[PDB]
Amino acid sequence: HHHHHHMVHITLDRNTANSWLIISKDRRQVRMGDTHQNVSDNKERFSNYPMVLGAQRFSSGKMYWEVDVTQKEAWDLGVCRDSVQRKGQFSLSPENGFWTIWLWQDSYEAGTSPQTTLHIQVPPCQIGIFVDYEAGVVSFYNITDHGSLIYTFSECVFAGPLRPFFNVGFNYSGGNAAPLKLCPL
Numbered sequence: 001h002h003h004h005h006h007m008v009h010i011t012l013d014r015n016t017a018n019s020w021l022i023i024s025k026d027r028r029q030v031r032m033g034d035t036h037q038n039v040s041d042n043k044e045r046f047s048n049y050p051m052v053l054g055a056q057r058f059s060s061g062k063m064y065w066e067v068d069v070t071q072k073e074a075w076d077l078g079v080c081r082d083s084v085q086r087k088g089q090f091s092l093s094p095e096n097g098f099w100t101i102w103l104w105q106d107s108y109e110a111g112t113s114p115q116t117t118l119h120i121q122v123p124p125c126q127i128g129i130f131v132d133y134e135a136g137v138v139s140f141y142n143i144t145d146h147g148s149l150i151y152t153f154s155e156c157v158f159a160g161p162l163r164p165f166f167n168v169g170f171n172y173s174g175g176n177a178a179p180l181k182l183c184p185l
């Protein structure tokens with residue numbers, strides 16, 4: 001892929017974060033805290049899962065960013081509609097406004113309904129996410145493996161502005177405390 005030149009500087013939106021998340025001063029790193037992080041509730045916060053959005057909203061053009069997932073056991077990454085459900089239980093699917101991949105229990109899967117098995121030979125330490133708004137495309141790249149394609153959602157029906165989407169995952173195991181980090185351009 002030669003998508004690097006559509007690179008955008010993503011920052012995390014504290015107001016959307018689940019109340020257990022800890023976001024760094026530069027708004028580029030997020031991890032699961034061991035308790036409630038002493039913030040007020042609001043209608044934006046994801047209540048049920050350790051999720052947060054980027055502050056940027058995209059309604060046109062081509063956008064590319066990279067995320068570090070080093071030593072995590074579980075995470076979700078991709079984009080979502082600005083209008084996605086925040087409260088209660090929901091599944092990650094394009095019908096619910098999400099275009100995502102994840103690691104869970106030693107397998108990688110794309111967030112279709114039902115979910116799709118991914119075939120990755122080199123476990124990624126950094127993921128590239130490419131959005132072409134006009135083409136209706138979301139693609140995922142394995143930066144550890146020289147940029148090899150992971151998955152492409154095509155014929156996407158975005159149906160509104162898009163936000164970068166993150167889930168640090170739970171840490172029931174004690175092996176998933178590590179942060180997600182937005183990588184420098």
Ligand SMILES: CC(=O)Nc1ccc(CN2CCOCC2)cc1
Pocket residue numbers: 074075076092102103104167168169170
């Ligand atoms: C039964 C079943 O398939 N469970 C399941 C639930 C959630 C996800 C999505 N992500 C995975 C990474 O951790 C955060 C959540 C994937 C699988």
